[PDB]
């Protein structure tokens, strides 16, 4: 059950943004959204794929454990901030593409398909290159499926050890306050091409009091200056609803 | 740990607020600790709420706490603070230091099993006498700054005699600050304003993960006035800020 909420629209309006926010209190059994259609429209996950990729890397032994260090070989990487040794949480927090590319290479095409099926992750389309299917390939997922996936992670209900789900959940903490706790991940496919904008994501969940709220946001983007909106629009919404 | 050295430079932060206290700061990779006060670093004090860490571990291990989604229901009988008069999750009771909630866990764990796990954990003097619901706030259990950092290091490394899963559950409960460059796990303690000439004790213990490095810390200080409480965080914060660890 997905119910439309019109009282969030001003936040999209005021910024000239074409996007969707999906928010579910307690569970995915009833979610609210500004856009029914777009709530279930499927986009490239970009770095939001680091969540399932991380779980898969741990499950298959490719990530040896919680304290694994991803050593930099000194070879040039696309961002200076990726040019250093990284923990799992460090690599997730700065979206070190090349670290997770190498994890996917070692997981390999057969095992990757296996887990995306168990995880019911989007269209499960990993075709066209093991190291880029989530960035520029054919894998697609929706705000709704993102929320369903994150809830399973929250409840340890994914087909993976409790231990590995706990390990990944700690790597996803992005805000801690006495009153609430935020787990979240960003994604950004790029600026897109001729009349085909990229997509930007912010997905996660917020624990406040004895309550839980799972959220997923996406938006079309053709200009990187617009990227802070991926967090400020939904943050606005969750501030007014009284979640954070 | 592997070594300790006394670094009296940090005294600046203490003298400022005229605090009698100790900060212990350990670097994981090099296995070395630094402190302003070697003597006080080994002195043993009431854990107070810092004991909520092992108690949480024990509580989950014994099954007294079902899992991490367990809610500790507030009945309705008055409690010592308004904060504690509500339903809390494990992280909630930890973050607000809800004494009654952990008192209840302690009783359900019981003395034999509590004695056993603290033996396993090498937690301070291991004296749980003076009740079973106050042995850490006003009883006989005492722990040193050095012992805290070793304990906390074992937790981080999942090396405590409890399931890795249970240690992960507690560890997530201890997150108090998250930044893209560093993560702080920590817990406070406060035994009370104490008596005449013998003041109470305030704690701040935890660790910081920054880059591929990890920093285990333990702070305590003498305290006779609740107004001074916030110094339990601001002194070590400034030490670790000036060490370049946080900020």
From Swiss-Prot, chain A:
Residues at the catalytic site: 47
Ranges in coiled-coil conformation: none
Activity regulation description: Activated, with respect to most beta-lactam substrates, in the presence of 0.05 M sodium bicarbonate.
UniProtKB keywords: Antibiotic resistance, Disulfide bond, Hydrolase, Periplasm, Plasmid, Signal, Transposable element
Disulfide bond sites: 24-31
Domain of life: Bacteria
Residues at which a beta-lactam binds: 95, 186, 188, 230
List of residues that carry N6-carboxylysine: 50
Main location per the UniProt record: periplasm
SUPFAM superfamilies: beta-lactamase/transpeptidase-like
InterPro entries: Bact_Transpept/Beta-Lactamase (IPR050515), Beta-lactam/transpept-like (IPR012338), Beta-lactam_class-D_AS (IPR002137), PCN-bd_Tpept (IPR001460)
Effect of residue 6 to M: No effect on catalytic efficiency with respect to penicillins, cephalosporins or carbapenems. No effect on resistance to penicillins, cephalosporins or carbapenems in C600Z1 E.coli strain
Subunit text: Dimer.
Stated family: Belongs to the class-D beta-lactamase family.
Protein's recorded name: Beta-lactamase OXA-10
Naturally occurring in which organism (per UniProt): Pseudomonas aeruginosa
High-level lineage: Bacteria, Pseudomonadati, Pseudomonadota, Gammaproteobacteria, Pseudomonadales
């Amino acid at each position: 059950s997905i119910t439309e909420n019109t009282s969030w629209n001003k936040e999209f309006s005021a910024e000239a943004v074409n996007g969707v926010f999906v928010l579910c209190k307690s569970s995915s059994k009833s979610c609210a959204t500004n856009d029914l259609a777009r709530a279930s429209k499927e986009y490239l996950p970009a770095s939001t794929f680091k969540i399932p990729n991380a779980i898969i890397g741990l499950e298959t032994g490719v990530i040896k454990n919680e304290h694994q260090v991803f050593k930099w070989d000194g070879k040039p990487r696309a961002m200076k901030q990726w040019e250093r040794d990284l923990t799992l949480r460090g690599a997730i927090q700065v979206s070190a593409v090349p670290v997770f590319q190498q994890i996917a290479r070692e997981v390999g095409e057969v095992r990757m398909q296996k887990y995306l099926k168990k995880f019911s992750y989007g269209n499960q389309n990993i075709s066209g290159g093991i190291d880029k299917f989530a960035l520029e390939g054919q894998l697609r997922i929706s705000a709704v499926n993102q929320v369903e996936f994150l809830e399973s992670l929250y409840l340890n209900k994914l087909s993976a050890s409790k231990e590995n789900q706990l390990i990944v959940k700690e790597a996803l903490v992005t805000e801690a306050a006495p009153e609430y706790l935020v787990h979240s991940k960003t994604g950004f496919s790029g600026v897109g091409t001729e009349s085909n904008p990229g997509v930007a994501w912010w997905v996660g969940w917020v624990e406040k009091e004895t309550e839980v709220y799972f959220f997923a946001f996406n938006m079309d983007i053709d200009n990187e200056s617009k990227l802070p909106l991926r967090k400020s629009i939904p943050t606005k919404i969750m501030e007014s609803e009284g979640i954070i």
